[PDB]
Amino acid sequence: PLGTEGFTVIDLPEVAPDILPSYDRCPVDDYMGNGTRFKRFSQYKLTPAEDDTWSFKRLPHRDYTTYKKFNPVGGGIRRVYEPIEVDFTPLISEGIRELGLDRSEPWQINVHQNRTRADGGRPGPLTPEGVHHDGHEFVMIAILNKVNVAGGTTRLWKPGADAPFWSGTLEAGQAVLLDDRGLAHDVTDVLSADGGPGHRDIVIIAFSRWAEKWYGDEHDAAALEE
Amino acid sequence: PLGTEGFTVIDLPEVAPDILPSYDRCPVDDYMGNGTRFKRFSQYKLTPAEDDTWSFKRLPHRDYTTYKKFNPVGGGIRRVYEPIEVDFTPLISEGIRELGLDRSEPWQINVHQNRTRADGGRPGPLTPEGVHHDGHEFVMIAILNKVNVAGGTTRLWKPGADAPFWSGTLEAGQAVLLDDRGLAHDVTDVLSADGGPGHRDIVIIAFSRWAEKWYGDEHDAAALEE
Ligand SMILES: N[C@@H](CCCC[N+](=O)[O-])C(=O)O
Ligand SMILES: N[C@@H](CCCC[N+](=O)[O-])C(=O)O
Ligand SMILES: N[C@@H](CCCC[N+](=O)[O-])C(=O)O
Ligand SMILES: O=C(O)CCC(=O)C(=O)O
Ligand SMILES: O=C(O)CCC(=O)C(=O)O
Ligand SMILES: [Mn+2]
């Protein structure tokens, strides 16, 4: 599973040919990134299956809701996103295998398909939350494509620390897996590499046990403080 | 001068008939508020003048720049805004009078003309920076108009405190004057009062001595860290 410090970086297998083009059809994120971000969103149930396998079931499509206490800029509100068109589950399976997800109970995942654009004079913010926890138990962040960008450096932090203990610029074909409770993270802004437009296409998977799922009326009421 | 706690709330006189309608002609803020905010921006020199008066001079129009250390979500970048069309200087003068602005050197002000909209299910964020200092010496925030909104409560904080020491929802015709160094501030989101659209129109005036002005090539280089 995860390394001693609570994170691992892995290489990803080749992706299906429809995955990278699908980022061109993600609509603008109306809630984050102030026009620099484009997004689709889907949620799944993860059930340990017969054999040492995991079965994915896409859940009925719902608005994304998170807590203000984890996300001060995009928490506490209903975030209406379009569903993800492509199938990320083979890539997610790689993260499940590296995590050694506990098979004693089922899991629920949030899947964020994000493109962030940068241009000369206008960086693309990746974590306007600042140093943060996403609020889940494990998080997988996979880089699918980068074009003409600098910056975008992932930094891992122990709670309370003045500086990160690990930093690295994740490249296309890499993913980081992290203990989202024991570590916090941020990422530096995407910059234009040459003064012209550039972009960074990623998928973020947030893992929670089904018994603490981030899905349904009860979760929504808590995140929205209703 | 300001109250012993570093702030004062004042009533403003009647404003010229062109002020309130001008908020309808502010374009969207491309950089903050994720489409909920609309903005114009101008900068002035304030010079002491004969007979205990102050003279205003509108400076050549430049991009707004502020520091990431003060503004985590909109700092460190060039923010291209359009100039303010109307004349806020009589209202600003009321702030100067109540501050008892030091006449021993000239001043420079940033003037932000803001409209934030709220709607059913979509609050309008007023301080996505969180609890913050704007970075200047004094700040004046004036409410010009509020239609169909709840929330929008100003909170003043002693530096590093975990709770504000003063709270109040400023209404149309009111302004707060603040020691921007000795206190920090935030404001709760504006909410739809009844489920439909509402808006809150304000002007923010940030005061710095001319010798520390937030204007020109040197300031921009420092704020952009170049
Ligand atoms: N902080 C990201 C989401 C990261 C995943 C967290 N999750 O799914 O609760 C956002 O607000 O867009
Ligand atoms: N616009 C000037 C200051 C105000 C006028 C100076 N002046 O007399 O030409 C500046 O860029 O610093
Ligand atoms: N925090 C506000 C500006 C408040 C005035 C401060 N100033 O002029 O540097 C913004 O980023 O839009
Ligand atoms: O862009 C990234 O690498 C991760 C972003 C992230 O952690 C978030 O959006 O919560
Ligand atoms: O909307 C307000 O009352 C104030 C905004 C503020 O403090 C800032 O924008 O720095
Ligand atoms: Mn995150």
Residue A130 covered by a domain: yes
Q: Tell me if A39 is assigned to some domain.
A: yes
In angstroms, the CA A136 to CA A104 distance is: 18
Please list, in sequence order, all residues whose beta carbon lies within 8 angstroms of the beta carbon of residue A100, skipping any fewer than 6 positions away: A1
Helix %, strand %, coil % of chain A (to 5): 10, 40, 50
Hey, is the C-beta of B24 within 8 angstroms of any chain A C-beta? no
The verdict on residue A100 lying in a domain is yes
**Do residues A81 and A42 make contact, with C-beta atoms less than 8 angstroms apart?**
no
B122 part of contact set with chain A, CB < 8 Å: yes
Tell me which residue in A34, A78, A130 faces B31 most closely, judged by beta carbons: A34
Does some domain include residue A1? no
CB pairs under 8 A between A and B: 29
| Structural domain includes residue A163 | yes
Instruction: Kindly state whether B131 is in contact with chain A, defined as any CB-CB distance less than 8 angstroms.
Output: no
Sheet holding B198-209, edge to edge: B7-11, B174-179, B138-147, B198-209, B107-118, B37-49, B53-58
Instruction: Give the method used.
Output: X-ray
- Residue (of A87, A81, A91, A197) closest to A146 by Cα position: A197
CA–CA gap between residue A180 and residue A134 (Å, rounded): 7
Residue whose CA is at the smallest distance from ligand 2 atom 2: B59
A146/chain B closest Cα distance in angstroms: 22
- Report the residue from A31, A121, A130 with minimal CB separation from B78: A121
The alpha carbon of residue B75 and the mean position of all alpha carbons in its chain are separated, in whole angstroms, by 15
Query: Residue A196 is part of which domain span?
Result: 7-223
Q: Which helix (H) or strand (E) holds A92?
A: helix A89-99
Tokens of B185: 């501030």
Task: Give me the sheet containing A138-147, strands edge to edge.
Answer: A7-11, A174-179, A138-147, A198-209, A107-118, A37-48, A54-58
CB of B59 closer than 6 A to ligand 2?
Answer: yes
Q: Is residue B69 part of a domain?
A: yes
Is residue B1, in this structure, part of any structural domain at all? no
- What is the number of the ligand 1 atom nearest to the C-alpha of A132? 1
To test the pocket of ligand 2, the residue of B65, B209, B215, B217 to mutate (highest count of ligand atoms within 8 Å of its CB) is B215
The token pair at A91 is: 């890539």
Q: What is the resolution of this structure in A?
A: 1.9
> Does any CB of chain B come closer than 8 Å to the CB of residue A73?
yes
- For the beta carbon of residue B181, count every other beta carbon within 10 angstroms: 15
A120 to chain B: which residues are within 8 Å by CB?
A: none
Compare CB distances from B130 to A30, A72, A125 and report the shortest one's residue.
A72
Counting ligands in written order, the one closest to the CA of B33 is 3
Q: What residues does A219 pair with on adjacent strands?
A: none
Total domains in the fold of chain B: 1
Q: In this structure, is residue B44 part of a structural domain?
A: yes
Helix (H, G, I), strand (E, B) or coil at B93: helix
CATH number at residue A80: 2.60.120.620
Atom of ligand 4 nearest to the CA of A170: 3
